[PDB]
Amino acid sequence: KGEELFTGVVPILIELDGDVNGHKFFVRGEGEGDATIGKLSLKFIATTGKLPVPWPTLVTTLVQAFSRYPDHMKRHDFFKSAMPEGYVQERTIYFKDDGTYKTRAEVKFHGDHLVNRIELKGIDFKEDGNILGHKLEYNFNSHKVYITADKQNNGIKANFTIRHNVEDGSVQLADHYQQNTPIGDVDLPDDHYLSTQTILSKDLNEKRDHMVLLEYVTAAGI
Numbered sequence: 001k002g003e004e005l006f007t008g009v010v011p012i013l014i015e016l017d018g019d020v021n022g023h024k025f026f027v028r029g030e031g032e033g034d035a036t037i038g039k040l041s042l043k044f045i046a047t048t049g050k051l052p053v054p055w056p057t058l059v060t061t062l063v064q065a066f067s068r069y070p071d072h073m074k075r076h077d078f079f080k081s082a083m084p085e086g087y088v089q090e091r092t093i094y095f096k097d098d099g100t101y102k103t104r105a106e107v108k109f110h111g112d113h114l115v116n117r118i119e120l121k122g123i124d125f126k127e128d129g130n131i132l133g134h135k136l137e138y139n140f141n142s143h144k145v146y147i148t149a150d151k152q153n154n155g156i157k158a159n160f161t162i163r164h165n166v167e168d169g170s171v172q173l174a175d176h177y178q179q180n181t182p183i184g185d186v187d188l189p190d191d192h193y194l195s196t197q198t199i200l201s202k203d204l205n206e207k208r209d210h211m212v213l214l215e216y217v218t219a220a221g222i
């Protein structure tokens with residue numbers, strides 16, 4: 001089943017097992033996606049208590065199959081074509097003048113849910129840096145995710161740079177290098193990009209440390 005799985009609203013489960021400079025945390029997320037409009041609506045909870053890192057640094061790690069690929073570009077949608085068996089998503093993320101995240105995730109269908117299970121390791125972060133010092137604004141800018149085919153691994157690669165606003169009005173850059181490979185035996189796409197927009201908010205009833213996330217993503221560049 002390719003794409004067909006993304007007609008209407010699909011419930012989402014996300015789990016992240018994290019370790020940054022030796023500080024462990026676990027994040028669980030739930031919500032919904034509608035790929036026909038490229039919309040995600042999600043709520044994440046840190047079940048281990050307050051996070052050792054700011055929530056915005058985890059957004060990109062925490063289901064690009066929910067991009068809306070317009071009709072003339074549906075032959076380039078690797079993410080959905082790999083479903084339901086799914087794909088492995090791996091990243092190295094370099095925070096400029098600070099530490100790096102290494103991530104590995106399995107994205108696939110379990111029943112009617114799309115499930116993103118993630119392991120994250122963070123190393124060489126500076127206390128007195130923007131991440132461990134929590135100097136990042138609680139918001140998110142809009143970016144372009146540049147995608148190309150990786151024919152040798154039957155998948156794709158991607159690279160983009162996230163701009164995180166800092167308290168003092170400067171910007172903290174996070175360079176993302178990404179690789180996706182299918183879990184089974186897909187649509188391999190011509191060079192294109194995803195245009196991303198994101199809002200980060202709070203559930204006023206929620207006592208636990210958490211993040212509500214609203215995302216709109218569309219493909220373009222063809």
Ligand code: NI
Nearest residue numbers: 021022023127
């Ligand atoms: Ni420490």
